[PDB]
């Protein structure tokens, strides 16, 4: 048994939209709105298949239209923010001087707009990082990943700082080598 999901959404007034294919909870690819091209989750997939990004952008335009129609029908009911549930974990066992990856798993939140900044030591980190677009869920909340390849050491501490409108204070999740 397997499930392939074609999930798209549109959000106002931010005018943020997204189009992506999810397979058993793992993103196959997402369409980049700004560059107007298909972005595969893994590059290996691109050799075997292809997809026309124009057909994706056509559905997004409809999502904006239907969102405006549904909002007026609903008497302009707004959305109830749901704070995320952050969890920081490593990609593999932690050995000193052995390169590894740090993962920040944002989950169970809506609307799908958050701002995530890595905070190693007390100084933010911007290099080596990557992320994934918002992934769909069964309860119609969202999922997101933020990565950070780093080098473990006894005296280095990391934090994942998440900002969401459902939160009163930015949620701080900590990670440090303990032994």
């Amino acid at each position: 048994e397997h499930v392939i999901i074609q999930a798209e959404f549109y959000l106002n007034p931010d005018q943020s939209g997204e189009f992506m294919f999810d397979f058993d909870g793992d993103e196959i690819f997402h369409v980049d709105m700004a560059k107007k091209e298909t972005v595969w989750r893994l590059e290996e997939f691109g050799r075997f298949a292809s997809f026309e990004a124009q057909g994706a952008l056509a559905n997004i335009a409809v999502d904006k239209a239907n969102l405006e129609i549904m909002t007026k029908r609903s008497n302009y009911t707004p959305i109830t923010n749901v704070p995320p549930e952050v969890t920081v974990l490593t990609n593999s066992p932690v050995e000193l001087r052995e390169p590894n990856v740090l993962i920040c798993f944002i989950d169970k939140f809506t609307p799908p707009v958050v701002n995530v900044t890595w905070l190693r030591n007390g100084k933010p980190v911007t290099t080596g990082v990557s992320e994934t677009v918002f992934l769909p869920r069964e309860d119609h909340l969202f999922r997101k990943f933020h990565y950070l390849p780093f080098l473990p050491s006894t005296e280095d501490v990391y934090d994942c700082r998440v900002e969401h409108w459902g939160l009163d204070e930015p949620l701080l999740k900590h990670w440090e080598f303990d032994t």
Binding site: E1, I5, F9, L42, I69, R73, I79, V82, I103, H140
Partner: protein, 200 residues
Amino acid sequence: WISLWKGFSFGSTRPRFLWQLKFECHFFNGTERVRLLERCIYNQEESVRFDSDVGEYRAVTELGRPDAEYWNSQKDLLEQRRAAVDTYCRHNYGVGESFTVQRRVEPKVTVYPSKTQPLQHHNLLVCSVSGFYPGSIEVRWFRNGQEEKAGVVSTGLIQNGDWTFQTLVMLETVPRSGEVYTCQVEHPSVTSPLTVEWRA
């Protein structure tokens, strides 16, 4: 690789409004039984849906009632949707069967001691399995060649978002010097189960 088209609805510090739709293809026993489910979700509540089993558009809330009557009036849309199980769900499966359904990645197993509490005697033992695909995996703990099924606490299947999984299966034990512990992992990626040992 096809993407399904969609029509229009019926009608015409800041607050936020969210709309989303999801096309779900469900495969049972492979391609033998396929089911297509379309959802229209305003904010966090589903309003209207189309089920391949029923063959029509049905409303989930009060908001989805206009769309259900409207979209069911379009006969060409319904006749296209009922046949979308083959033209859309079954198509993408054939396109993606090679590198997703038939994808196998070998796990990497590590065993190392740890302490559940600062008892400082390394009572707990950790079997770390990471980087495998798909998720279906069986990890067993063996002590001196005998299966230890009591006192095994684990982490569930962890999804890394990069098409790889990880999991930790832990054994709370009193490590006697001279005993050999074995962690056995059984995965679709391997014909024979992987074994890793740790000597006190």
